[PDB]
């Protein structure tokens, strides 16, 4: 009899001051807010029901109305920022944190879920949830010798909520909160559930999306080898955040990049750079570009792993945004590499797919490619073989492209293209 109530009826029951009438109206609200097609969230809000739901969270004597109001508030909080804000403005945050200590597992889980929605709205609500003290009782729910004894859905909700506490920037989460959470994240990163693993990887990807000090906090916990293992998973929902995390780490120092290499990550990149999912290829190529921006011994490990032909591959055919990251990978390679490494790059066939991308109507990739050509010619000057490279570029139609580019519109495109022709084709 709690199916398809009007908002007016729900208000009538909740205002009745009959606890059981209130419980049935709250359950009716929960079923309303649980429907797929446009749940009347805003009408529930405007009816003034949120403070009453929040008050019901504290009725320890009537656990069913705690659960129903928690569920109703969870679904309101899952909406827009204004809808989440209505939940927070009703005082729900400390009331949900108190519910984390509920002896009923289905009620504390609902509190975990609700706080995940609130924290996931943005850094302000994330930090407000942290200021109200949510981290200690959340982590206490995971203080068991073996995570496998916890209910699967329960563990998945805790992991997801912890990942939202790690999420968002400007500002990033408080350093103290990250250090408090990280040891539990590391443990969840070794759990056997694919959804726990995915959300753990997402959390790590958030924490590594920042300056080197943030990256260092994660790398020092020793998780890179486990991230690399998850890089090789068959589940795309795991590979995607694992790769994002690895890519974030290699934006840091050369020493942090070396940990990724030392863990064996380059051996997975043959598959990643030919992955059928466009986003994986783009992220993997972007990651490669930040590795080819490292030291020469790191460029050398890219060579040793046979990854240069795979870079030639993505430059030759891929989604355009992937080809753009490949261009960056080549320019970084040629800027920091030895002469021998640059020679090997030409021997693997980089010139023709480089020239073909000068037809692209993207002015930045043109500058990137022109830079790489300059870098390759500079290595050819040290060998006295600029002529043979000029013939190569002409034979594949590149010279026609480069001098079409002297009539280009954007400044350093035409300056660089004249400098090439004046110096090597004249």
């Amino acid at each position: 009899g709690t199916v398809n109530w009007s908002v007016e009826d729900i208000v009538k029951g909740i205002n009745s001051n009959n606890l059981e009438s209130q419980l049935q109206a709250t359950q009716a609200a929960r079923k309303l807010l649980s429907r797929e097609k446009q749940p009347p969230i805003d009408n529930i809000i405007r009816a003034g029901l949120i403070p009453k739901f929040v008050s019901f969270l504290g009725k320890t004597d009537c656990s069913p109305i705690q659960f129903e109001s928690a569920w109703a508030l969870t679904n309101i909080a899952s909406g827009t920022s204004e809808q989440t804000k209505a939940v927070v403005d009703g005082g729900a945050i400390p009331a949900f944190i108190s519910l984390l200590a509920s002896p009923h597992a289905h009620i504390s889980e609902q509190a975990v879920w609700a706080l995940g929605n609130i924290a996931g709205d943005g850094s302000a609500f994330r930090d407000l949830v942290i200021k109200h003290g949510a981290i200690d009782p959340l982590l206490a729910l995971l203080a068991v010798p073996d995570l496998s004894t916890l209910a699967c859905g329960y563990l998945r909700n805790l992991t997801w909520t912890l990942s939202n506490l790690c999420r968002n920037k400007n500002p990033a989460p408080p350093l103290d909160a990250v250090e408090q959470i990280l040891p539990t994240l590391v443990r969840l990163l070794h759990h056997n559930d694919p959804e726990v693993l995915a959300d753990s990887c997402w959390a790590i990807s958030y924490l590594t999306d920042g300056p080197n000090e943030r990256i260092e906090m994660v790398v020092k916990k020793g998780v890179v080898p486990q991230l690399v293992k998850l890089l090789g998973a068959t589940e795309l929902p795991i590979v995607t955040p694992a790769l994002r995390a690895i890519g974030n780490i290699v934006t840091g120092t050369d020493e942090q990049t070396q940990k990724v290499i030392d863990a064996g990550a380059l051996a997975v990149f043959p598959s990643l750079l030919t992955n059928p999912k466009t986003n994986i290829q783009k992220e993997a190529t972007w990651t490669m570009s930040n590795i080819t921006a490292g030291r020469q011994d790191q460029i050398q490990q890219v060579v040793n792993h046979g990854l240069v032909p795979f870079l030639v591959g993505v430059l030759s055919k891929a989604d355009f945004k992937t080809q753009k990251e490949a261009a960056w990978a080549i320019t970084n390679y040629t800027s920091g590499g030895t002469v021998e490494q640059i020679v090997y790059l030409v021997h693997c066939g980089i010139i023709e797919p480089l020239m073909n991308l000068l037809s692209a109507k993207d002015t930045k990739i043109i500058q990137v490619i022109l830079d790489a050509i300059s870098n390759i010619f500079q290595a050819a000057e040290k060998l006295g073989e600029t002529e043979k490279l000029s013939i190569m570029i002409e034979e594949c139609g590149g010279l026609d492209k480069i001098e079409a580019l002297q009539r280009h519109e954007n400044e350093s495109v035409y300056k660089a293209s004249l400098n090439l022709i004046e110096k090597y084709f004249s």
């Binding site: 999306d209 994002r244 890519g247 934006t251 972007w286 930040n290 921006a293 960056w328």
Partner: peptide, 5 residues
């Protein structure tokens, strides 16, 4: 140089 995301 390195390019953050």
């Amino acid at each position: 140089e390195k390019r953050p995301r």
